Design a protein around this ligand. Sequence first.
Ligand code: CLA
Ligand code: CLA
Ligand code: CLA
Ligand code: CLA
Ligand SMILES: CC1=C(/C=C/C(C)=C/C=C/C(C)=C/C=C/C=C(C)/C=C/C=C(C)/C=C/C2=C(C)CCCC2(C)C)C(C)(C)CCC1
Ligand SMILES: CC1=C(/C=C/C(C)=C/C=C/C(C)=C/C=C/C=C(C)/C=C/C=C(C)/C=C/C2=C(C)CCCC2(C)C)C(C)(C)CCC1
Ligand SMILES: CC1=C(/C=C/C(C)=C/C=C/C(C)=C/C=C/C=C(C)/C=C/C=C(C)/C=C/C2=C(C)CCCC2(C)C)C(C)(C)CCC1
Ligand SMILES: CCCCCCCCCCCCO[C@@H]1O[C@H](CO)[C@@H](O[C@H]2O[C@H](CO)[C@@H](O)[C@H](O)[C@H]2O)[C@H](O)[C@H]1O
Ligand SMILES: [Mg+2]
Lengths: 34, 504, 34, 38, 341, 36, 33, 37, 81, 30, 63, 167
Amino acid sequence: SYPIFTVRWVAVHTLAVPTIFFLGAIAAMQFIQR
Amino acid sequence: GLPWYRVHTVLINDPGRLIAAHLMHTALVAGWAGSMALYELATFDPSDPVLNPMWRQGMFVLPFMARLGVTGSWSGWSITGETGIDPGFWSFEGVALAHIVLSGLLFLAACWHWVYWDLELFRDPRTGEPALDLPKMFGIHLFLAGLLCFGFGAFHLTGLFGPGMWVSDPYGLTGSVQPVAPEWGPDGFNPYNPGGVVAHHIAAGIVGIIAGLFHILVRPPQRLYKALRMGNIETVLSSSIAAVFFAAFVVAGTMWYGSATTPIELFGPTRYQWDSSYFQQEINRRVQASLASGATLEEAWSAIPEKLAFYDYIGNNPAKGGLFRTGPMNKGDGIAQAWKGHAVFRNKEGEELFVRRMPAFFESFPVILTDKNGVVKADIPFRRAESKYSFEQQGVTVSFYGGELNGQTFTDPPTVKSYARKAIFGEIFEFDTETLNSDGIFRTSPRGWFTFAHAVFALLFFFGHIWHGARTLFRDVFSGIDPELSPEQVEWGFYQKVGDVTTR
Amino acid sequence: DWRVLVVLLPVLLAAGWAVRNILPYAVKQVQKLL
Amino acid sequence: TITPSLKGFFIGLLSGAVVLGLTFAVLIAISQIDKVQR
Amino acid sequence: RGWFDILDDWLKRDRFVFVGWSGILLFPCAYLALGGWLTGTTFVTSWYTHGLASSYLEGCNFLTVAVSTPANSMGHSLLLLWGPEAQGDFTRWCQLGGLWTFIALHGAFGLIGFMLRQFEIARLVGVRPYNAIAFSAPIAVFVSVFLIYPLGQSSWFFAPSFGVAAIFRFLLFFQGFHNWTLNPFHMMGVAGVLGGALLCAIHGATVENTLFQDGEGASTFRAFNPTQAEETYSMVTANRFWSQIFGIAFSNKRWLHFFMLFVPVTGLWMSAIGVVGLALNLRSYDFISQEIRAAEDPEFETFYTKNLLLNEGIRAWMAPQDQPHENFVFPEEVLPRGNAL
Amino acid sequence: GGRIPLWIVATVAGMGVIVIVGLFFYGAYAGLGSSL
Amino acid sequence: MEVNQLGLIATALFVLVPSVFLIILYVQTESQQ
Amino acid sequence: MEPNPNRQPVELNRTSLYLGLLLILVLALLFSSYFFN
Amino acid sequence: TTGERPFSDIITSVRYWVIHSITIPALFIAGWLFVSTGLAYDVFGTPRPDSYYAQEQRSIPLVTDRFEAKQQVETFLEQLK
Amino acid sequence: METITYVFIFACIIALFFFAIFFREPPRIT
Amino acid sequence: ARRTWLGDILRPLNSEYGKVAPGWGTTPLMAVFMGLFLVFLLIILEIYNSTLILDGVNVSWKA
Amino acid sequence: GTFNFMIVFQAEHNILMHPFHQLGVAGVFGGALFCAMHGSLVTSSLIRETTETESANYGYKFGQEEETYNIVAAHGYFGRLIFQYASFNNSRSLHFFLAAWPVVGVWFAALGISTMAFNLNGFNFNHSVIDAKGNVINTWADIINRANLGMEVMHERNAHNFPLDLA
Ligand code: CLA
Ligand code: CLA
Ligand code: CLA
Ligand code: CLA
Ligand SMILES: CC1=C(/C=C/C(C)=C/C=C/C(C)=C/C=C/C=C(C)/C=C/C=C(C)/C=C/C2=C(C)CCCC2(C)C)C(C)(C)CCC1
Ligand SMILES: CC1=C(/C=C/C(C)=C/C=C/C(C)=C/C=C/C=C(C)/C=C/C=C(C)/C=C/C2=C(C)CCCC2(C)C)C(C)(C)CCC1
Ligand SMILES: CC1=C(/C=C/C(C)=C/C=C/C(C)=C/C=C/C=C(C)/C=C/C=C(C)/C=C/C2=C(C)CCCC2(C)C)C(C)(C)CCC1
Ligand SMILES: CCCCCCCCCCCCO[C@@H]1O[C@H](CO)[C@@H](O[C@H]2O[C@H](CO)[C@@H](O)[C@H](O)[C@H]2O)[C@H](O)[C@H]1O
Ligand SMILES: [Mg+2]
């Protein structure tokens, strides 16, 4: 009976979406050699 | 009763006593300006506008008088150094006297308005309560502000009826009070163009006259009257503190960065002129033009004015002072007497070396001499045991061109080193340290002191703005929140809109 | 540039997956909203 | 004449107007659709 | 019921994250300043502005990443993306330090947005606005340090860079160049910060140890109910305790809580005033009377004189690499060193 | 609503954090930034 | 030590002026009914 | 002439005296070194 | 109590984990590929470990000119070849 | 003068401690 | 309260306390002037900042 | 003398790069933050018992039984400032947090100093970033090291006779 998309949903995903992307990027950086 | 920090709140619903308080403030400020001017005139040495100008002597108000055209003293000197002008009444002493007289007249008016607080003018003709129609008082004052702004721009600054303003060449050598025509192009917005200052005051003045008329004739919207609490005099205080801190940050910035209203002959050079070697580049340009015409090295440097060389000296940089290093710039290095001339350093191979100059960040700096390609050729080393670049080892000598020591050459390494240590400061000057008991430690200029005081005041005034704005908008909770505050207003899940009982 | 697609490959392909598992209920939210 | 920094200035002025404009159209639109029950 | 009033209705709806009119300013500016910082510290170098690596992408860790200030040659340029320096090229804008000004400017407007949020919510719920007033202190600190300090200096380069170790460099720069520990405005700041943490510790501990027994559990948090009218701890016992331990004690709970606002807020304001002075190099660098005496008496030594030598070491050993726009070549023989080390 | 127990979600998410931070600590000793 | 000649008067007034202000307000408070 | 009804009594309690004096003396002790310089 | 669905009801639901067992790895993998394709270097202008210096260079490519800084960087990058 | 000034201000502070402790306004339960 | 000569002259200027224009009044016009003022301030900020470079405008003492 | 101790300590131990000192800073900044926050929220929620002409502090009587502020109002503000579950509604929990935050942080600070007493120093990342050739690429930690070197070479300038400063 609750809504799915809210101002809350947007605020969560504006943080959580780039966060997971950035965590994958930084994980891949652990395997860069010089 | 009232706590100490609220004693002046007894004026809030007493317009006649508010006017009295404001008159007493204006009396004190005008009295300050007269007394300060007179203390400066008692202390100012006007005999040397070249190496001892007003900005070396700790003169704070004297550049403000000179900027708008007050050049002379009744004792017969003028700030430019010109012999035999008569200023009429409006000398520096005549300005000071006009402020003291005004201070006393405002003092008497304050007494009258304090005693005769209960005027019918301050009463609402319908309720009988003390009431000030603040929106209409704004339009009246804005109109008056606009007339004065216009007349100052159109008549004083243009010279149409008035003296004009201080204007100078880019190197601060030949400044004087001149009439200034308005600049109506886009170069009117160049802060270094004095014609912009004229054009601003004409245009903003007219706009103030027009807006003042609008504010006289059109009432506020009910929406804005409610939102801005326009029946509360504290709302004006909140907004006036804000406009004032805005203006203080602007004058702090234009003092620090320089503008046509802050010229270097009145306030000293800026730190950015030392940063960019502004005067060093002009000195070298004039020398190379002289050497491109067949002058000798003595002839080229002897043509550089002492005034121009004196700007190329780090003890005139306003970023070299200290917060508790008090007094004029003369109290540090001394009263400058003469340019010693330009020191040229050469090693025993004949190559010219250049002393790396001190940046303003550095309380102390090492003496390092490079060639024209920036390769270190000589220094004054700290540890002597493995030193390879010492002045004794590289055969460093120093010769002077122009100035006091013109044509002289020095070879003994103690003497060459002591000049090299002075050469980190830019141009080398002879200083009288004995008159003021100068301590040898740099002080900042009026440009620095002004910028400090105004940035500090502006930052504090931001707090006053927040405080009085909060007092204005939250006047109903000032002594506390409503003791029957509904928990439904503040708990989640009852009102659709926060603090709206109709949305329940 | 072939690399913008590759980075946008899992982003696009999982946005479309979440807009499929939420479409029977994102419709119902916006319908009663009208 | 219009210098490149002037055209650059007009770019930033227009880009701010578009950011504030599209933000305020979206906020107005959602507000008109999701009114409070009074 | 105009469009303004309906928009006001929506902005002030009770929701999980309150928006408000201030949220129009706050939420994009905060998100961009936060997101700009993470973006720059993950992916952006400082190689062209400072000659430093400053990102996870280059091998730095959380302590050493930073969004570094622009080059000194940029002066105080706003460094807009569309400005004359980057000319719309995003890659070059990142290389020139445009993310620094991006974070600083959006951080500034976000902080405004946050104080506006404090006013707006306090006005809607009906409480006094002292939390916004207390937030003036971190704003005063941010403005003085991140804006006024570099504006007084030659360029944004000398502002603090947004990074952990970069800030540590800023701290050691202020010792070596400004002797900032000697500055009475900083000292007032330290007292407000340490006095604030003391009041935080002592008030918390005093309340927790003068609690009334309001329930049967040995874990005492359950014995509180937010709808109670009664004080949960004994002010009288707390007062008697502190009067006998320390001599003085609070006896007014309202004054106690105001003093807790006042102490850290005043301290931070005082430090801000000191930093404004340091914008113009108006330092409390030296005590003139000791310098006169130390110059003439080579046996006079104090902790202040020792600190000045430390400061001279900091300047000489750090300036060539900390200020690479100057092209300082300090030969090894000019560097100040004591014996042996 | 109440399919997966929140303790299981907490545990797997808690362990996902450990693995990711542990990788970042592993990367302090290998590759870029390792001083080798 | 060679100190500022105005430091003594500056310190003495910085103490005495607001201290006497507070004493004045304290004393007249105590004398109220 | 009728007296002014906006007048208010002013107060400073003893603790405020002690706090203010503490403040003034500590600021004096702090800034005195800088005033002597 | 603001009417949104509770978070502990959402993240314990299977519909959430149907969605997020796809969206969460895809974002993580998209971030991984932004680095490992090398796109991160070209978007931001960050030097690769072999592009800090020219082969015999010891000096730093510092920007010295405000209005031609964009060209100074391009000249520094063209000297990396 | 300096030393006397510092010791004087210090001694006043110690005196103020004495009055603030032994001659405080007594906390009264009301 | 005391009537005075100057007070009776100035009386009409302090007579419309609390008087308002209905509703929004001239608010939309005010907002436009505020917007233009913001643009004006940006322009002069950017000239002083050398972010906005105009022909004929050399922002320097040498001008 | 305190400042001399601090500067030399940083030179010799890199205290700024030690996480215990960093927790100390979080303890003291957070403590001052929380001091300001708690002071401000209580002061904001004071219940009206006084007029505008008197200090609101006279609204509280020593040893009164009633609460002098509305903690429900304060929670209703601060839980809308952040979000509802970020805010304490239990005064006992709130005051425990005010105790525990600066105390635990200062404990870490004290342990920092007391463990640098045995020369377990803060993080050393000097030359951690190396290019493909092997060139040192400086980071901010490398700039800190230059400052550290300047204090180190200058401190106790006549006391050292041998190359390493060992105690
Ligand atoms: C064509 C006619 C004309 C001309 C030639 C001018 C010319 C000028 N105007 Mg004027 N003006 C005009 C008409 C004109 N004006 C009209 C009709 C109005 C409306 C009444 C104005 C209103 C106006 C204002 C309000 C100002 C000017 C200013 C100026 C001067 C700009 C250069 C300068 O020194 O700015 C320096 C100032 C700026 C570049 C503005 C800075 C804006 C700040 C940074 C905004 C942020 C403030 C905030 C508090 C900062 C806090 C953060 C900080 C601590 C880091 C120049 C003389 C400015 C001035 O007087 O400067 C001395 C100024 O402030 N004009
Ligand atoms: C905007 C204000 C302003 C500015 C910029 C100047 C600038 C100048 N003055 Mg002037 N002056 C002013 C106002 C100003 N004055 C006023 C209002 C008076 C009347 C008292 C004077 C009377 C005066 C005299 C008699 C003399 C000067 C002189 C000077 C020059 C030397 C400056 C100096 O040594 O200061 C030193 C500055 C300081 C030591 C800074 C003081 C630091 C403050 C007081 C610390 C206070 C901290 C505070 C209590 C903390 C509160 C904490 C609490 C909130 C918790 C300089 C050009 C001298 C000169 O050279 O004339 C030719 C000179 O002899 N001035
Ligand atoms: C145009 C400027 C202006 C004006 C007219 C006012 C007016 C007022 N203020 Mg506001 N305020 C301002 C700016 C201003 N303020 C600024 C810049 C700040 C930040 C510092 C504040 C912070 C502030 C607070 C926190 C409070 C007020 C309060 C008040 C009210 C009572 C003042 C009083 O009785 O103090 C009496 C003051 C004294 C007996 C002594 C103060 C002495 C100071 C600390 C040092 C000496 C000052 C020196 C003599 C003069 C320097 C002037 C300077 C500009 C050069 C009155 C309406 C009070 C209020 O709102 O009441 C309900 C209140 O609580 N103000
Ligand atoms: C509340 C939201 C907010 C605020 C206050 C800011 C503020 C800022 N941004 Mg940010 N920004 C935002 C949201 C915001 N931004 C969002 C959501 C994004 C992502 C889309 C960005 C993306 C962004 C980038 C990439 C950059 C900025 C930059 C800036 C700075 C310069 C902006 C400027 O000069 O434009 C000027 C425009 C205005 C001020 C508009 C004012 C509205 C006027 C008064 C109305 C009239 C305009 C008129 C209709 C236009 C017609 C033009 C026509 C004649 C041709 C400034 C600090 C720059 C920066 O940070 O530099 C370091 C920068 O490079 N912003
Ligand atoms: C009555 C009369 C008269 C007379 C007049 C007179 C004589 C006046 C004077 C007056 C005056 C002569 C005044 C003065 C004033 C002053 C002042 C007003 C000042 C103030 C100051 C201050 C405020 C300061 C402060 C400070 C310091 C100290 C330090 C630093 C900081 C500061 C700056 C803050 C006559 C015959 C005409 C006529 C009518 C009647
Ligand atoms: C700049 C810019 C921009 C923006 C962007 C953005 C907005 C971004 C965002 C981003 C973001 C938003 C990101 C994120 C990130 C995140 C991260 C990276 C995280 C991390 C995490 C971690 C690592 C964890 C850890 C931890 C902690 C912290 C604490 C506790 C413990 C632990 C361990 C858990 C734009 C385009 C608009 C424009 C142009 C420029
Ligand atoms: C819940 C939770 C969480 C999380 C946590 C976690 C994440 C945990 C994990 C945990 C774990 C995950 C655990 C594990 C355990 C294990 C164990 C305890 C093991 C043992 C084993 C053993 C003992 C071994 C033995 C042996 C040997 C010795 C030899 C060979 C054979 C064998 C292998 C048998 C959090 C915080 C978020 C929040 C709150 C809630
Ligand atoms: C060199 C620094 C010197 C700074 C000097 C500072 C001066 C400060 C002046 C404080 C003046 C207080 O002013 C004084 O206030 C008290 C109350 O507070 C008033 O007193 C009035 O109220 C009280 C209490 O209701 C009644 O008992 C009294 O009969 C009545 O007159 C005085 O009539 C007024 O003169
Ligand atoms: Mg690694």
